[PDB]
Each structure stands twice: as C-alpha cells, then as structure tokens.
C-alpha cells in the first residue's frame, strides 16, 4: 500500500505546514501538523476545555462508530518551545492520503497551552519520530508510521516541503520525478528517539566549505534552523547590520539586506538553502528589523534541521531495520 497527501503552509512565512487527515467512521477530516520531532498523534476534540478552543476543527469520538476508549490511558507532552497538552486516548481508524491504519491511538486533548489555542489553522499534531518517545501511559503506543510499516510497499516516507507553496508527504514509495540528481543517504542514530544524523559541514554564501561534524535532528515540526553559535555567528557576520537581540531573542537584520545562501553537507553532497528562505520578515508590523531563519542552538541542547533546511531538499525518512536519512536537491 501507499499514501500521498498535500501539505500546505499555514501562513505567508511558512511558519508550519498542515496536512488533511481522516479520522473515524464516517471520516472526520482534521488538518494536522506532521512532526518528525515527536511521536504523539493528538487532536483538538469534544473533550477539550471549551475555553481553549478558538476556531479549530475538533474530533468527536462519540460520532465515530470505530472509536474505542483506551481505558486508563493518559498522555502528557511538552515541546521544546514550552508548549504543552494532555488528555486521554481513543483508538480509531486513521487515513492519510489513501493509506489507512486501523486501531491507531488517537490522543484526545483535554488541556492545551496558549500557543495551540492561538493557532486556529492547526487541529493537532501527527508525530513521526520513533515510537520510544510516545508519551501514552501506562501502555506506550506506536506512531502512525510504525503501524503502517507492515502494509507499505517500502518502509519509507518522504517530505517535499514547499517554499511559500504547497508540498507533499508520501508514504511507502519514492517519487523519482520529485528530485534532481541522486539521493545521498546518511546514517541515523535512534538512541534519543529522533531522526538524528551528522552533517559534514557548511558554507556561507560563496565562501569555502568548512568540514566539521554537526550532529542534529531532521524535524519537520520546527520552523527554523538551529545550529551551534560558532556557525551562526559566521553566517550573520556576512550581513551588514545583523545583530543578536536579547529583547527579540535571536538574530535580526535590516529588512533592506539581501541574505547569503547557506550550504550544509550530507556526506559528500551539498544542499544549498537560498538566502530568501532565511528571511522571516519584520519582527513586528511595519518594523525595519527582520527576523533571521538561522538561530543558535546554544539554549536548546540540540541542533535542529527544521523546515528552513528541509524545504530546500527532497528528504527520505527510511524506516528499514537500520534507519537512514536521504537528501536530494530539487
């Protein structure tokens, strides 16, 4: 079996991408944020504190003939940005782009933090990291991808994110029309539950490539690119007037500047991020200070190849017994 679904940016800055997902019988369609940095599938629902729902589409298990309460199971999750949610658990049928899993754990939110309430375009998250990070207790649950693996033609999914435009998540096959050149595969470590890999170096603009190992994670759920302070300082040093701002919490630059590209290494291959991808616009409406798309990971503890990096490539998440990550230009 295979599945294929279109993913669409939620706003003009590509702050996140939503993908339609069918839950229950008859189908209830919710727009979920596919997140390779977590492993919970959770949704706004009829059980969510009404105070904390502001325009989201909610899942109503009582209207699904295939929904079943997973008795005694609870979940609770906090993300790197300090947001959080918790609730109870149903199993139900879940389909993504024609690919159907029966008995998928659907985590129903009773409480959500303010960030989620404020974002009216995101009805929940679909986690695609490794199932060891799933927060359901006392019985840990498997991700959608792990449940689908048996039935997939090939145990892979691919992320083809667009720059200010729709893209595609595919399950079970590699679309050889979607990329140019060859795919470079690199080893993954599962020790922390993430799609963790080692980049082989970087270059700023047309400068010379610096060979140095950068351990990081491929995270579709994180907007920006977070790298070590040395690398990030080297990038912003090339932008006239760019500075790190404590009040804003990161590097900002004059909106009048043109940004250099950023290259990262995958084995012997090179992925180039166009400078325009790094512009996240004015810090406030009408400001001449713009927010940068490359930021320091020093306050985080892990380097994150988020959407800014991943949208520049065709990315293969290979969940074979020895997992690997593949990158190709497009």
Q: Which of 231, 288, 235, 226 is nearest to 257 (CA)?
A: 288
**DSSP E strands, 97-218:** 99-112, 124-127, 156-160, 167-171, 184-187, 196-204, 210-218
Q: How far apart are CA 317 and CA 128, in angstroms?
A: 10
Structure tokens at 116: 């989620």
Is-cis flag, bond preceding 138, omega within 30?
Answer: yes
Reported resolution, Å: 1.9
Half-sphere exposure of 215 (CA within 13 A, CB side): 9
Q: How far apart are CA 99 and CA 2, in angstroms?
A: 6
Contacts of 268 (CB under 8 A, 6+ apart): 184, 200
Three-state secondary structure call for residue 102: strand
Catalytic-labelled residue, pool 39, 45, 85, 199 = 199
Catalytic-labelled residue, pool 33, 35, 92, 279 = 35
Distances (CA, A) of 47 to 29, 90, 110: 17, 12, 5
Instruction: Assess contact for 111 and 133: CB atoms under 8 A.
Output: no
Distances (CA, A) of 51 to 7, 63, 81: 29, 22, 22
Q: Which of 33, 183, 176 is nearest to 115 (CA)?
A: 33
Reply yes or no on whether 35 is catalytic: yes
Look at phi and psi of residue 215 and say left if phi exceeds 0, alpha if psi is from -120 to 50, else beta: beta
Structure tokens at 140: 């840990």
Q: How far apart are CA 138 and CA 313, in angstroms?
A: 38
Structure tokens at 70: 């997973």
Q: How far apart are CA 131 and CA 35, in angstroms?
A: 13
Instruction: Assess contact for 220 and 305: CB atoms under 8 A.
Output: no
Q: How far apart are CA 159 and CA 316, in angstroms?
A: 7
Mind giving me the DSSP string for 227-264?
E-HHHHHHHHTTSTT-EEETTTTEEEEETTPPPPPEEE
């Amino acid at each position: 079996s295979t599945g294929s679904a279109t993913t669409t940016p939620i706003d003009s800055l590509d702050d996140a991408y939503i993908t339609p997902v069918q839950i229950g019988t008859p189908a209830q369609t919710l727009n979920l944020d596919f997140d390779t940095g977590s492993s919970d599938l959770w949704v706004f629902s009829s059980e969510t504190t009404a105070s904390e729902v502001d325009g989201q589409t909610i899942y109503t298990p009582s209207k699904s003939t295939t929904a079943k309460l997973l008795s005694g199971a609870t979940w609770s999750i906090s993300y790197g940005d300090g947001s959080s949610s918790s609730g109870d658990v149903y199993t139900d049928t879940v389909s993504v782009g024609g690919l159907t899993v029966t008995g998928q754990a659907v985590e129903s939110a009773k409480k959500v933090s303010s960030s989620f309430t404020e974002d009216s375009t995101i009805d929940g998250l679909l986690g695609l990291a490794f199932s060891t990070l799933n927060t359901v207790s006392p019985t840990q649950q498997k991700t959608f991808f792990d449940n689908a693996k048996a039935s997939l033609d090939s145990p892979v999914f691919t992320a083809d994110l667009g720059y200010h435009a729709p893209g595609t998540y595919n399950f079970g096959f590699i679309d050889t029309t979607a990329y140019t050149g060859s795919i470079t595969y690199t080893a993954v470590s599962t020790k922390q539950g993430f799609w963790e890999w080692t980049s082989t170096g970087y270059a700023v603009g047309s400068g010379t490539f610096k060979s140095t190992s950068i351990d990081g994670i491929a995270d579709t759920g994180t907007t920006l690119l977070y790298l070590p302070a040395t690398v990030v300082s080297a990038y912003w040093a090339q932008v006239s007037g760019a500075k790190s701002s404590s009040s804003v919490g990161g590097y900002v630059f004059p909106c009048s500047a043109t940004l250099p590209s950023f290259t990262f290494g995958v084995g012997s291959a090179r992925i180039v991020i166009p400078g325009d991808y790094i512009d996240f616009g004015p810090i406030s409406t009408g400001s001449s200070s713009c927010f940068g798309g490359i930021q320091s990971s020093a306050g985080i503890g892990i380097n994150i190849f988020g959407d800014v990096a991943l949208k520049a490539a065709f990315v293969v998440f290979n969940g074979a017994t020895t997992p690997t990550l593949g990158f190709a230009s497009k």
